[PDB]
Structures are given as structure tokens and as C-alpha cells.
Ligand SMILES: NC(=O)C1=CN([C@@H]2O[C@H](COP(=O)(O)OP(=O)(O)OC[C@H]3O[C@@H](n4cnc5c(N)ncnc54)[C@H](OP(=O)(O)O)[C@@H]3O)[C@@H](O)[C@H]2O)C=CC1
């Protein structure tokens with residue numbers, strides 16, 4: 515299948531601060547919503563706890579090592595292979611991150627969905643560095659600024675061959 519990364523990031527690749535986004539952009543969540551809709555979302559359990567609930571219309575798969583972790587409305591995988599085992603006949607798969615989880619699927623990544631925020635937030639979890647060269651870009655577009663989304667941000671999509 516197609517393994518896709520889906521990340522929002524800072525001009526310095528920052529993706530989170532607390533166990534939370536260092537920003538609050540409701541419109542960003544909607545490009546994200548519409549892109550992933552109808553597709554499994556694989557998210558690290560630390561990511562999940564930052565969302566606190568199952569996101570409708572998609573298979574929510576939560577990656578933990580913890581044999582006893584359960585949340586109603588989500589599957590759980592203790593493994594990259596268990597994730598693939600669950601996504602047996604899937605077409606595309608969205609790695610919804612946590613950097614620990616971006617790290618686990620780096621060998622499998624087929625494409626990239628990156629929002630770039632042009633601003634410096636002082637966060638502490640970063641999106642890992644990626645293949646110099648390789649990935650050819652396929653899509654650029656500018657998002658939506660307003661009171662509530664008061665940062666300049668752009669959607670990007672890359673693909674490797
Ligand atoms: N801006 C953005 O696009 C996004 C931002 N974020 C932010 O990033 C932060 C979360 O990222 P991060 O802290 O790296 O954590 P993660 O979201 O990657 O979740 C980490 C958890 O995944 C589980 N895990 C890690 N490795 C394995 C393994 N080999 N097998 C099974 N389970 C494993 C562990 O769970 P356990 O300890 O239970 O065993 C680990 O604690 C938060 O601040 C969040 O808001 C996250 C996603 C996107």
C-alpha cells in the first residue's frame with residue numbers, strides 16, 4: 515500500500531511543545547480532516563492523548579507497547595508489523611505522527627503531507643529530518659489567515675518514486 519506521513523510543522527521543524535500543538539489553528543484541522551477522511555490513522559499513544567477522542571470516519575489505530583491499553587472506538591497495535599497486519603488490504607495509510615511514530619515508519623514512507631507554519635514557536639518535539647534529494651514535490655498551496663488562524667501557513671505534498 516501507500517504509506518503517507520501527515521504532519522504540521524514550524525519554520526524550524528517544531529511539531530509540539532507540551533504534549534500538545536504549540537498553536538491553535540482550527541482551519542488547519544480541516545484540510546487534515548478532508549485529506550484523511552475514509553482512511554486509517556496511525557498515531558502514537560502520546561499523540562492520541564493529545565487528541566483525547568476517536569476522530570470520526572477513519573480507523574484510529576494507536577501505537578503503544580502497553581499490553582493493557584484500550585480505548586473504545588480505537589484499535590491498538592503494539593508493533594509496526596501489527597499495524598501492517600491490521601491494515602491488511604488497505605490502499606493508503608496515514609501516519610498521523612508523534613515523532614517516535616514518524617521514526618518507526620520512515621523505511622516504509624511513500625509520500626508526505628506537510629503544512630509549514632512561517633513562525634517560530636519554542637516547542638520541543640520535532641519532525642525528523644528526511645531524504646536529501648529523492649522526494650519530488652507535487653503540490654503547493656497557501657492556507658487561510660484570520661483571527662483564529664493568525665499565522666501564515668502553506669500546504670505541501672511530496673512523493674518519492
Ligand atoms: N504538529 C503535528 O502535525 C503533530 C504534533 N504532534 C505532537 O508531538 C507530540 C507527540 O509526539 P511524541 O512525543 O514523539 O510521541 P508519539 O505521538 O510518537 O507517541 C509515542 C508513543 O508511541 C509508542 N511507541 C513508540 N515506539 C513504539 C514501538 N516501537 N512499539 C510500540 N509502541 C511504540 C509509545 O507508547 P507507550 O509509551 O504507551 O508504550 C510512545 O510513548 C505531542 O506534543 C503532539 O501534540 C504529534 C503529531 C502531529
Ligand SMILES: CN(Cc1cnc2nc(N)nc(N)c2n1)c1ccc(C(=O)N[C@@H](CCC(=O)O)C(=O)O)cc1
Nearest residue numbers: 520521522535543544546547564565569570610611629
Ligand atoms: C493534536 N492534534 C494532532 C494534529 C494536529 N494537526 C495536524 N496537522 C497536520 N498537518 N498533520 C497532523 N498529523 C496533525 N496532527 C489534533 C487535535 C485535534 C484534532 C481534531 O479534533 N481534528 C478534527 C477536526 C476539527 C474538530 O473536530 O474539532 C478531525 O477529526 O480531524 C486533530 C488533531
